[model samples]
Target: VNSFSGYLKLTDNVYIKNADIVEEAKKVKPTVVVNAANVYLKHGGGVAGALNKATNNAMQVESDDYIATNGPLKVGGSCVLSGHNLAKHCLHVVGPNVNKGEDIQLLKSAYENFNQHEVLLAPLLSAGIFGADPIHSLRVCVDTVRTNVYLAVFDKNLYDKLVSSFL
Candidate 1:
């Protein structure tokens, strides 16, 4: 959970930090937390699960509102909500359900949309349970951002793995 565990500079203003996403969120307190999730706000696993747990499941409630009204959130689309115990706000994105081979376009769109904020805290989209290669996903994330983006690398293995790719 150390904020300074390690970090990789992907772009001038974009970095990949080997730290706990929620803990880092508590420390950095960015303007927005961009998380990969479905329209249902189903924070069942990975980053979504950790975020939901940290917020006392508040994110799920907000996401449920949209699900009850509209259909499933479209891939590459997003919804915004107030952060309950994390950053000032949260941006939930509907990422590609499949693997890396199909998600780059959607990931790009999600990143482009989330970049509306000045500071964004995010994880490697589709690299977790969503099924995508970490490096490829990180590349899409690095390329899509126009402002400050911190890729929270919570897992040690992922950190080690990604470090080799960049360093």
Candidate 2:
């Protein structure tokens, strides 16, 4: 599906929004669903909380196990889990604790490390709780997560905002 026509060659495979993330996950059947988590892998807030709720806390249960053995999965680090969520696998990456340029690079590193999947669904990393601009975050995700990444934005206005920025 052609997503948009712009400087960026927008395609369904590249980016998408205004659709159900979980439902889209069902369609893409991505090997991993990337969520922004903390070093402790807590799913109590932000995108982590949303995914945790959608998957019936399966993400948190598995994350707890991951943390118990692995300790803090610091920024640019991640853990993969499988407990029947929206996707077959769930990838939790530690997002920025504070807004810093280096933190954006760290977010990029998180995606780079988890770069072993045919398709992946991701939110705007470090953009919400971490307070990065959504457009900048999307630009980062597009540039960093190059392995068939599909971005899921809850608000169409956000999508339009990004598109207009590109124009």
Candidate 3:
């Protein structure tokens, strides 16, 4: 999980990194760290699961509060809550589940929710159990950010597959 470190620049304000999202967030302290979330904001598995555990369920509590106050999100819907032990803020986005008929446009809309933040740590949304193709997910990430975004690449093999795409 630690062998890769270098980044490939995407935009003047965006780059892709082969690194752990939370660890990199600790280093850069991004304005917001994006989560590939469920509508319930459960933080139960995939990126959400790992992040929630890191914060000792503090993120879960905050997430619960956000849901209680604002209601569950729709596909492409989002909210920002305290990052708890992780960063200054966490941007929770309900990404499209491709198997259920949601497509990359909806997935792209989920990412379009990013705003007013210059620096961000974003996981590959919809690429896990949500069922979108990882390669296209990475493409969506690379094309969407207008801020200083780090497309956190956590898996070594996934990093290997993506390296040539950016170049």
Candidate 4:
């Protein structure tokens, strides 16, 4: 399981490489592609500032309805309070908001769970607010991690994958 995150543009390359790696891991076919991303928006919910609840509610109407749950996941465009929501582009993939610590731990556990199940194609973001560099974070995660993982395309659609993984 190789962990990587080269500039944002390198995302595409990782996705394609994941495809090839998946083929090599034929033993683990029918794997679930987890599309994790490092999301950032103008909303300075920093660690202390809570998400704009009102804006989140309104954005839900215009953004993806699938993220209706009461979590850190924020959707919609120009969330008045909105600026950048990675979930919008990675809807097809399963990406818990990296901004929220609670959700971040959950995501990490989810990856562990998938590994226990022998699932493949796991994408994880290293630097969002943690300040961990790509290679460094990847090393830290993979060091103690016991799972086979792969990355998803940077800009590719993951809505289908999300639907399949959850629904």
If scored against the real structure, what TM-score would every candidate get? 0.87, 0.81, 0.88, 0.34
**Which portions of model 3 miss their true places by more than 4 Å?**
1-5, 99-101
Ordered by TM-score, highest first, the candidates read 3, 1, 2, 4
Query: Clash number for every model?
Result: 0, 0, 0, 4
User: Which runs of model 4 end up more than 4 angstroms from their true locations?
Assistant: 1-30, 37-63, 73-116, 127-131, 151-167
Model 1 backbone overlap count? 0
**Lowest lDDT 10-mer window, candidate 1?**
1-10
Residue pair clashes in candidate 3: none
Q: Distance (Å) between predicted and true CA of 70, model 3?
A: 1.5
Model 4 residue 20 CA deviation (Å) reads 9.8
| lDDT values for all models | 0.77, 0.69, 0.79, 0.32
Which candidate's lDDT is highest? 3
For model 2, how many clashes?
0
- Which model, 1 or 2, shows the larger lDDT? 1
What ordering of candidates by lDDT runs from best to worst?
Answer: 3, 1, 2, 4
lDDT of 1 by residue, 29-127 (tens): 777888878656788988999898888978888778768887677778888888777888888877776653454567778678767887788887777
